[PDB]
Amino acid sequence: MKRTFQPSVLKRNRSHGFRARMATKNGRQVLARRRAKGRARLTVSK
Amino acid sequence: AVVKCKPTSPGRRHVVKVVNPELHKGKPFAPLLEKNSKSGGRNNNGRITTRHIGGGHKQAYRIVDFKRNKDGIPAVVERLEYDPNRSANIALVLYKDGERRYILAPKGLKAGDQIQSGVDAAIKPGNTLPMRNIPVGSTVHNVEMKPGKGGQLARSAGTYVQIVARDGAYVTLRLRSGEMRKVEADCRATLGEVGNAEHMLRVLGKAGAARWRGVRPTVRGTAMNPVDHPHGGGEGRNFGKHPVTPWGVQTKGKKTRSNKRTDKFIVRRRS
Amino acid sequence: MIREERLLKVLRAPHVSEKASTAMEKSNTIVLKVAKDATKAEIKAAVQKLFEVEVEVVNTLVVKGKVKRHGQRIGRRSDWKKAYVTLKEGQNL
RNA sequence: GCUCGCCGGAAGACCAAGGGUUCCUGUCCAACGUUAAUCGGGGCAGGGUGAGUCGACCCCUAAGGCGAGGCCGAAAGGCGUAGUCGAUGGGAAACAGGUUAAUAUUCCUGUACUUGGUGUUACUGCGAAGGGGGGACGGAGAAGGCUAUGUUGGCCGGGCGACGGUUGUCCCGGUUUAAGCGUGUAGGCUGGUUUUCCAGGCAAAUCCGGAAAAUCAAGGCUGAGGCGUGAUGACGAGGCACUACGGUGCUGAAGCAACAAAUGCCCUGCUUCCAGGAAAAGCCUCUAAGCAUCAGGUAACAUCAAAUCGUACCCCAAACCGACACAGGUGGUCAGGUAGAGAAUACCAAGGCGCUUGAGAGAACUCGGGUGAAGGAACUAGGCAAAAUGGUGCCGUAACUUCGGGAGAAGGCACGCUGAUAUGUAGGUGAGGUCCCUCGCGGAUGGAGCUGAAAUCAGUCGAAGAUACCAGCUGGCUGCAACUGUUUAUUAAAAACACAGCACUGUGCAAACACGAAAGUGGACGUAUACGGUGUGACGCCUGCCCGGUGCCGGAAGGUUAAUU
RNA sequence: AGGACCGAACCGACUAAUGUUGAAAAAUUAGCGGAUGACUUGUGGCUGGGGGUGAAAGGCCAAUCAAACCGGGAGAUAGCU
């Protein structure tokens, strides 16, 4: 049966990528929280 | 012509089509076209703001001359064309200086006919004059509401306005609603009725014919749950509410006009 | 013209393999590990000025590094750039 | 290695997405593999992805996103103009053969093509963000011309048969060849060409649009395929020779014709219909400012460039999405033979597989199937399930009906093979020849060869000829819903929803209404034959009485009545 | 010509059996409906939680829905166990 995760790299990067996060104050706050936590990977980009 | 379909399938049994054999069979005049993508009745917030709009056939926009500003220059009707963007047929016309324009096709208009706009124009259908030059008791259409703005009233197939009086800088018009309205005498109108008067006599015959026109199904409030509509709910079929819109406003008799700015231009409501 | 500086940086190694030896003895092609940002023009000029042979054409590809495990710990080797450099029938590197 | 079995519109092949070394070679068998494992998509090491022409990048835009100023909003922000992004669409160019353990339209061989930079000689009005043309567009249908491809014959090579026969109208195999260049065909579209003038195309235009004159009868555009060339080549059945028996090395005949034939191509055509069918650039053309014997442009020539990134491998799957080496899910392309209407179905080809536990035994019981005396729904909530019917042609077919239907109603007959009609018919295809020629890929006659149903008559085998697979059960009365549709993803598919139609009601356009503190936006680039809301639900005959209650609509005297003073 | 007819692909899901620590957190097998349309499908886009979207089942909005998910108020409160 068709499951929920249907991967597409373009859609992934557009919805969750670094530039999408940088485009709004709330996304920038995501990156601030993740940096403060010390995440090795801030976004889906890499 | 208004022709009845033969019942060779149930979806054809009730179809009544309107076949104008005078309409051009080729493509529209390409310089007067524009792209017109569809809304699905959604606004710039991406929200549905008018229900029951979606799908239907792709349509190119035809730039129609509602202003009729080439005054004093005669024009000959090239041909009549189908316009998907409106009920009325349109006419491709050729001006003597080589300009081509689309106009609303008035009743009686044919290829070869002569049309003219402006103060001097003859009193005959297709001609456009300021209403201070049109006799009281004339039938007109494509009537301006502000001088120079372009026609806004009596544009649908078969519609028209009656100039009932002329007083000072104003004329009293009868509209199709039956409303009496004052419009400035400097406003232009085109003589005659809008053509294609048999438009109202077509019968779609099937659900799919409504879908071709971009009309999506209407669900009755009484078929819904209370959360969805004020009419919603009930074990079996129940009503016991006063009929109301989905947003709770009475929908059988309650008047909704509130425009104090324009109240002065109305002489008598439509009744 | 490309500075001698750059040309002394662009070439890293001869690539030694059976396909490389086959290319040498069948098509007069030398196979070279080159800097990742080296272009065909730069590789041509460097080989022509430092091995004093005359170059027909350079073909390039990028080799992607292999994911590996050193003591159950995940690493990855570096991407490197390989150059097939055709020499003109009588140059004999 | 030999046999057997399975798939073959796939269980073969090639991509896109997604994955990321799983690819190839060596070596190892702890763990991983539902067993063992010498094996592996497992461990470890090395190797492997080669582009001016494929794709990305790039030029161009769609929906939509962002958005200088700007408008709006406590702040955050929202909207949006100029712009600038954004493919799933438009835009330059390469093919065949050979080669590696693993890449190839990328390497090699042979033969091509495209865009730009410079520089020659020749001619010369060049130039935009502006104008015009073009690009540039739906659905359905029909038929003609083809090709892919197949069959048969001819040809060439090979063969004479493990058991009766097999020098023959016998058997096996092969009979392939591209882009490009030349030719402009079947066929489709449009009448050209020149002079004069003009309220139009933001300004000008020699361009386009328009009006008029003269003149002429074929001009222009588009266009499959064929033919020629590419090719005195390559490929090629096979044969000989090595062999580290893995695959190479060496050499290589024939390479024609007829017929059939697409869902592919002409075709973005043609015919027809209403629901009326992107954009922008590249491209062509016009001029403005500008330049004015210059730079700039148009042809032929030389010469330089065409970067960068992807390219292995899986890809209906053991490599992607499903926790698994999971009977699930996943868009596009290719399309052989016999039978068949067919991409159904059966058996096969090319190609790929036997699904990572086996060995016995032959109890009950369970699962999936086969057959069954006599009876035939007695079973059961209910014929649930099963059995049955099933094709083509022709005969024949009721009530009722909105005249279409109902209808494949029902019911019934024929059906294999062989021979004759007719040494293979009707039909289709069609060569040589001859004739004409405004001269060719021509037209007319011509009819060789090829191909080929169906029918009838006569015989003939079986229990049975639509013999397998495949493939309607039928009829009568009645409720409900007109109908085709839609729905509770995962216990409900219905009488529920929708529906065409009908009615009421709102709405005069800065519409009513909706989203939004607002600006705005949708409604709609619509205008009462329109648009919103509500109820009813095709169609036919119809739709009675009640305004006391509640709501809505109108009223404007009297009472009561806010802030205010 | 047709929301026309029969029927593959394709889309769906009416009946039965199996399966129910499944081969599968909805499938398999044998039948079944639509199959030029109100059809189906790829790629990308837009609508955001009292909000969307809904041919309307309170359906669906990432195996979650009479108010999603994640974090925070937060050690909510719990005459109850």
Swiss-Prot record, chain A:
Xref: Pfam families: Ribosomal_L34 (PF00468)
InterPro entries named among the record's database cross-references: Ribosomal_bL34, Ribosomal_bL34_CS
Transmembrane regions: none
Quaternary structure, from the entry: Part of the 50S ribosomal subunit.
UniProt GO MF annotations: structural constituent of ribosome
GO biological process terms held by the UniProt record: cytoplasmic translation
Family: Belongs to the bacterial ribosomal protein bL34 family.
Name of the gene: rpmH
UniProt keywords, alphabetically: Ribonucleoprotein, Ribosomal protein
Name under which the protein is recorded: Large ribosomal subunit protein bL34
Entry superkingdom: Bacteria
Cellular component terms (Gene Ontology): cytoplasm; cytosolic large ribosomal subunit
NCBIfam families: rpmH_bact (TIGR01030)
Species, as recorded: Escherichia coli (strain K12)
Disulphide-bonded residues: none
UniProtKB/Swiss-Prot annotation, chain B:
Family affiliation: Belongs to the universal ribosomal protein uL2 family.
Protein name in UniProt: Large ribosomal subunit protein uL2
One Pfam family from the record: Ribosomal_L2
Impact when changing residue 229 to Q: Loss of peptidyltransferase activity in reconstituted ribosomes. No change in rRNA binding or assembly into ribosomes
InterPro entries the record matches: NA-bd_OB-fold, Rib_uL2_dom2, Ribosomal_uL2, Ribosomal_uL2_bac/org-type, Ribosomal_uL2_C, Ribosomal_uL2_CS, Ribosomal_uL2_dom3, Ribosomal_uL2_RNA-bd_dom
Residue ranges with Low complexity bias: 38-47
Organism taxonomic ancestry: Bacteria, Pseudomonadati, Pseudomonadota, Gammaproteobacteria, Enterobacterales
Coiled coil feature spans: none
GO biological process, alphabetically ordered: cytoplasmic translation; negative regulation of DNA-templated DNA replication initiation; ribosomal large subunit assembly
N6-acetyllysine modification, residue list: 241
SUPFAM superfamilies per UniProt: Nucleic acid-binding proteins, Translation proteins SH3-like domain
Note: This protein can be partially replaced in vivo by its H.marismortui (HmaL2) or human (L8, from the 60S cytoplasmic ribosome) homolog.
Gene it is expressed from: rplB
UniProtKB/Swiss-Prot annotation, chain C:
Domain of life: Bacteria
Signal peptide range: none
GO biological process, one term: ribosomal large subunit assembly
Molecular function terms, GO-annotated: rRNA binding; structural constituent of ribosome
InterPro entries, sorted: Nucleotide-bd_a/b_plait_sf, Ribosomal_uL23-like, Ribosomal_uL23/eL15/eS24_sf, Ribosomal_uL23_CS
Record Gene3D superfamilies: 3.30.70.330
Alphabetized UniProt keyword annotations: Ribonucleoprotein, Ribosomal protein, RNA-binding, rRNA-binding
Keyword Ribosomal protein belongs to the record: yes
Gene Ontology cellular-component terms listed: cytoplasm; cytosolic large ribosomal subunit
Methyltransferase recorded as keyword: no
Pfam entry (one): Ribosomal_L23
Subunit structure: Part of the 50S ribosomal subunit. Contacts protein L29 and trigger factor. Might also contact SecE and probably does contact SecG and SecY when the SecYEG translocation complex is docked with the ribosome.
Function comment: One of the early assembly proteins, it binds 23S rRNA; is essential for growth. One of the proteins that surround the polypeptide exit tunnel on the outside of the subunit. Acts as the docking site for trigger factor for Ffh binding to the ribosome (SRP54) and to nascent polypeptide chains.
Family: Belongs to the universal ribosomal protein uL23 family.
Protein name (database record): Large ribosomal subunit protein uL23
